[PDB]
Each structure stands twice: as structure tokens, then as C-alpha cells.
Amino acid sequence: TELLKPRTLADLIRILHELFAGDEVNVEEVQAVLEAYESNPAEWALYAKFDQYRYTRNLVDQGNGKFNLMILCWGEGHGSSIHDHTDSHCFLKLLQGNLKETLFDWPDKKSNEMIKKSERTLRENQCAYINDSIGLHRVENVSHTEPAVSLHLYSPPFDTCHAFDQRTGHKNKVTMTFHSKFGIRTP
Ligand SMILES: [Fe+2]
């Protein structure tokens, strides 16, 4: 339970393996360790594979089945749907640039406009946390000039979620795909 500052991305991953050795998750400790890693672009360049048209998901570590650790690369103006997290913990740490996170409540069964609960600007090295009990979110790179790169940890791993129609609250199941795994493009 003794948390030390990760010296490198590799060191962070080693620490994460320790933190997820059991069946439960100390959220505050995981967030603190992620926050404490100082982004070093040389260490994650291998995973930072962008697409011109949308954000990409790049698998870094499979957490011996306990978690997926991945790097997401957001071109200028790229963003996500309003989505849930499939009964998993979700940690988001900025490695480069800024992202806007908008929070939404779970919709009622009635067809209605989903109104923003709040928004914040997540900045370099900051780590946010979300789960389904907190609500839904959208994550966007609103920059016109700066690509963003973020480090995401989901536990347990999941490869499907829901996207919500902002106009109605209607949801559709979506399958998440990986752009690359362990530095290797996986078309
Ligand atoms: Fe998310």
C-alpha cells in the first residue's frame, strides 16, 4: 500500500500491476499514481498513432486481465460520443494538450434533450475519474492547433459501451476497436 512516484511509463505500469493484484480497486490511490507520473513524450511516442479523421485507441498494457491501459490520440477538433463505461472504473490522464470533459446525467425513459451537468478543462498531467454511478461524459479536443494525447485505464477491461444521442437520450451499443496494440498497427 506504499505508493511511490512512477519514474517512467514502464515504472507506472509495474506499479499499476501491484495496485490491481487483488479483486478490488483503491480509486484514490490509482488516480494519485497516475497523476504523479510526469508525462515524458519519448516513453509513449510508440503508442501515439493518430488518424486524420477521428481519435484513436492504442493498447499499451492488458493488466494481466485486470485492466486495459491505452493511449488515446485526439486530432484537432476530435471528440467522443456521450458515453458510459460498462460498469467499470475509468481513469483519464492527460499526456499532451487539453481536453474538455462534459458531464451528463443518465437520461430518463422519456425522449428529451440531454442537458450538460457541468464541464471542465482537463490539463496536461491531470487525471480525471469517472464511473457509471457518477454519470455519463463526452471528451473533446476543442483545440484548433494542438493534438491531445491521453492515457486511459479501465477496470475491468471492456470492449463495448453505449453512445447516447444528445437530442433524445436514446442509446445504442457500440463496439470499441483498437487502432494499435503494443505499438503495432492492428487494422
Ligand atoms: Fe469515457
Side-chain angles (χ1 to χ4, degrees):
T1 58
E2 167 151 323
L3 306 179
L4 290 173
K5 177 188 165 71
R7 309 154 37 259
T8 65
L9 179 55
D11 200 39
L12 174 61
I13 293 170
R14 195 266 307 165
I15 295 161
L16 295 169
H17 291 334
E18 298 174 3
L19 289 173
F20 288 84
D23 296 325
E24 300 290 315
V25 178
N26 189 320
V27 167
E28 293 79 16
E29 283 188 356
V30 175
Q31 189 168 343
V33 165
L34 287 163
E35 182 111 12
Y37 165 63
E38 283 176 52
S39 177
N40 175 355
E43 298 174 351
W44 52 254
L46 177 67
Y47 312 107
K49 304 180 199 298
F50 285 73
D51 183 80
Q52 185 184 337
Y53 306 104
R54 58 153 292 175
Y55 76 93
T56 58
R57 308 186 160 269
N58 301 280
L59 193 58
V60 178
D61 196 78
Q62 286 178 309
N64 299 138
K66 290 282 182 54
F67 67 77
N68 280 332
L69 185 72
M70 61 188 76
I71 283 176
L72 272 63
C73 300
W74 313 79
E76 295 91 335
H78 288 176
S80 81
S81 66
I82 297 166
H83 61 272
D84 61 1
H85 302 85
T86 309
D87 285 310
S88 295
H89 302 282
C90 182
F91 302 82
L92 199 170
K93 186 208 166 73
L94 266 293
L95 296 179
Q96 173 188 293
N98 299 279
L99 294 166
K100 180 171 81 153
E101 184 196 33
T102 304
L103 297 221
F104 293 87
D105 282 317
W106 282 93
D108 296 327
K109 268 53 135 60
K110 264 204 64 201
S111 181
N112 269 127
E113 166 104 336
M114 305 181 71
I115 299 288
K116 315 147 180 277
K117 191 198 309 152
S118 62
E119 57 179 66
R120 56 163 161 170
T121 297
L122 304 169
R123 307 190 176 281
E124 286 191 4
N125 284 308
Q126 296 184 357
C127 183
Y129 172 75
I130 194 166
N131 63 43
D132 287 347
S133 71
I134 292 170
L136 302 175
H137 76 175
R138 192 203 293 279
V139 176
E140 295 172 282
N141 181 15
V142 299
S143 186
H144 291 258
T145 53
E146 299 299 341
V149 179
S150 53
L151 179 65
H152 295 236
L153 187 153
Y154 298 120
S155 183
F158 61 92
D159 43 27
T160 69
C161 71
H162 299 95
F164 298 75
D165 174 2
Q166 191 173 353
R167 302 283 75 81
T168 62
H170 179 74
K171 78 189 200 307
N172 36 110
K173 187 173 200 192
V174 162
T175 299
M176 331 278 278
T177 65
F178 286 120
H179 188 71
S180 69
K181 298 188 212 202
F182 321 114
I184 304 296
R185 179 77 178 88
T186 56

